[PDB]
Write a protein that binds this ligand. Structure first.
Ligand code: MG
Ligand code: MG
Lengths: 237, 215
């Protein structure tokens, strides 16, 4: 038995200088510590080189993170795609709590058979969900549009209000909703921005916004991370 | 499979702070140590060190965590900066520029050259009998790569010298009386680990020690 729930955080790949690296954002790791009450360890994006079942057995929960990169149908990460898309299905079937953020939310939809808009802002009837360019983190990650919780699902069960404001840092978004996914929230332009996996044995939630950001200061972000954290505690037991 | 923690470094990438770990170390952990590599965030006091140590079977240290792991009997392998930090953590010192000491060679890699050239063996390495490297079966002399501008100056109390470069630089150390495998090397044995029997022997010893703990 462990001191804390061990929460795996998906890495991305990146070339830095002459070397390939696996990377994960500081804000996701601190949100795990401070919002979920877990110990964050970073899962390498090695695809089939790591034994997936050994990996799943080692964690109490999985945070599928946001990324500048995009699931493959310009900035891509096939190395991540090959780790996270079997993994997220494998974790949910194992009863391992899963929280998907931004790219990870899009990956949950894709893994269950759905599709994405590659450019939400070029569909014609959505708003522009991208962050404002050339500005600091505090401005880019501040709340920018409303979010309408659909009743009877995970988000309403955790106690979120019917409407609240969220940040938005995404050029892609959900088009066809995968079968077996419950819609948890819609942006004001009808875009699906949160989903849950129907019948999942454990917590299985994805959101398009970035609740890791300054998590303790936003009660809606914090409630998401605390519910995720509780589910990771439950699994450890 | 033992869960082997690989230390991350912090790096600013555009707007955001990231925690990063080299692909080659992670693959060496998989292929050479037979472990499951998980990357340990460089969060310092923000994480609980004792919870961190309990969650791993071993620690690969690159670039007081290393001290606490050793005191706890968690196997440790230090590489390059990780070997240097092992020395400092026990009270030793470093040369900031080995190539400007005057009686060492230049231990840096050739600049503006591809990885294959930079990480190929470049100088000899002389094992000091009777320690960890002897005991895992390494020959008395073998060739190693060399990608370092710093190196060990004063050896910390409580460390055994394991090997010397041909200019006398201490390039490997172990921790006397450690409950578990506790080895630091200045060179880069993760590099194409399966193809070099001396690098592989080190990684297999490390992995066997991590499996022990995993029991
Ligand atoms: Mg949005
Ligand atoms: Mg050298």
């Amino acid at each position: 038995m462990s001191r804390l729930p061990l929460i795996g955080v998906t890495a991305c790949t990146k070339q830095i200088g002459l070397h390939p690296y696996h990377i994960a954002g500081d804000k996701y790791l601190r949100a795990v510590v401070n919002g979920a009450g877990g110990l964050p360890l970073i899962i390498p994006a090695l695809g089939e080189s790591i034994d997936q079942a050994a990996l799943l057995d080692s964690v109490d929960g999985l945070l599928f993170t946001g990324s500048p990169s995009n699931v493959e149908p310009t900035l891509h990460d096939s190395d991540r795609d090959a780790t996270t898309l079997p993994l997220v299905r494998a974790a949910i079937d194992a009863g391992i709590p899963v929280l998907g953020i931004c790219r990870g939310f899009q990956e949950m939809n894709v893994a269950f058979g759905g599709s994405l808009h590659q450019k939400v802002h070029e569909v014609g009837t959505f708003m522009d969900h991208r962050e404002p360019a050339d500005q600091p983190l505090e401005v880019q990650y501040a709340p920018r549009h409303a979010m309408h919780v659909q009743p009877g699902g995970v988000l309403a069960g955790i106690g979120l209000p019917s409407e609240f404001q969220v940040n938005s840092i995404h050029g892609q978004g959900v088009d066809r909703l995968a079968p077996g996914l419950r819609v948890e929230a819609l942006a004001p332009d009808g875009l699906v921005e949160a989903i849950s996996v129907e019948g999942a044995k454990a917590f299985a939630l994805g959101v398009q916004w970035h609740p890791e950001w300054q998590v303790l200061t936003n009660p809606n972000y914090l409630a998401i991370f605390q519910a995720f954290g509780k589910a990771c505690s439950k699994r450890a037991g």
